[PDB]
């Protein structure tokens, strides 16, 4: 039911940075002052939610960070600093395998899918992820850091998804604003059935 334009929202990602450039996105966490839970479906669908919250840095740093850079090989490399892991995504099938056993990379996979590297979200039809990345100009290397573990109550998972989405937005010239980034985050978490 929650799927809205989650199937037909097409993007055209284009390499918008120079070959030796690295995109750094970063976000603080949040503390909800009031109205938490009222944004949770289906109650939010019944009557709408009200939430007062604010963004906060912890120990003078943004706890959510993402680096995106071009890759010589026409695949996607995903690295996790907090989980200390790495994974290579070469096909559309691998990119959309969100529930892969032992993989901590469901969030960046869903984010890259929403950015147009999965066929359902791409305006242009591509034969394979490798061909789409060859037309793109390079592969993509995404390094992620959630300095605060998920389940801490500070919004780690959603804000990390948004940070990946914003970094990919800048890296691919999708021209999303912050509101659209948050809406794409909602779509992402619906893809992951959070």
């Amino acid at each position: 039911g929650l799927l809205d334009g989650i199937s037909n929202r097409k993007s055209t990602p284009k390499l918008d940075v120079y070959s030796d450039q690295i995109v750094w996105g970063r976000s603080p966490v949040r503390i909800d002052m009031a109205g938490g839970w009222t944004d949770t479906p289906p109650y939010s669908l019944y009557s709408g939610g009200n939430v007062v919250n604010l963004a906060i840095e912890l120990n003078g740093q943004p706890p959510l960070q993402v680096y995106v850079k071009p890759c010589k090989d026409f695949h996607i490399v995903l690295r996790s600093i907090d989980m200390g892991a790495m994974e290579i995504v070469s096909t559309f099938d691998e990119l959309q395998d969100y529930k892969k056993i032992g993989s901590p990379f469901s969030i960046p996979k869903a984010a890259l899918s929403l950015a147009g590297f999965a066929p359902a979200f791409s305006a242009v039809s591509y034969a394979s992820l490798e061909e789409q990345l060859k037309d793109f100009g390079a592969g993509i290397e995404v390094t992620l850091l959630a300095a605060i573990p998920a389940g801490s109550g500070l919004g780690t998972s959603s804000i990390l998804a948004s940070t990946v989405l914003g970094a990919i937005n800048d890296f691919c010239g999708l021209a999303w604003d912050k509101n659209e980034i948050c809406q794409r985050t909602l779509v992402l978490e619906q893809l992951l059935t959070t």
Partner: protein, 96 residues
């Protein structure tokens, strides 16, 4: 209104406890009772169940008192204060 803000934060904590009995384990309640007299209010961020405790001290002196109390009476070797500051930037992105 700072006082009303702190009191309403406390009320949010009460509402969250009423929605979820597991959000306030007895150890968190003991930590709270250690310093509850120096706050206008407090709550756990998000779904709670433990983790981080947000406290609104009555005044800077009360905040110093809270820090001293929780430092001299740590509930476990891992507990620690985390400095929080309001972010005037939100999500930022830049290029090398």
């Amino acid at each position: 209104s700072f006082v009303e803000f702190g009191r309403l934060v406390g009320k949010t904590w009460e509402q969250n406890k009423a929605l979820d009995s597991g959000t306030n384990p007895p150890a968190v309640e003991a930590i709270i009772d250690l310093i509850k007299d120096y706050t206008l209010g407090y709550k756990l961020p998000g779904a709670g169940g433990g983790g981080y405790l947000y406290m609104v001290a009555k005044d800077p002196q009360a905040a110093v008192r809270i820090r001293k109390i929780l430092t001299e009476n740590a509930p476990n070797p891992r507990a620690r204060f985390v400095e929080m500051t309001l972010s005037d930037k939100g999500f930022q992105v830049s290029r090398s």
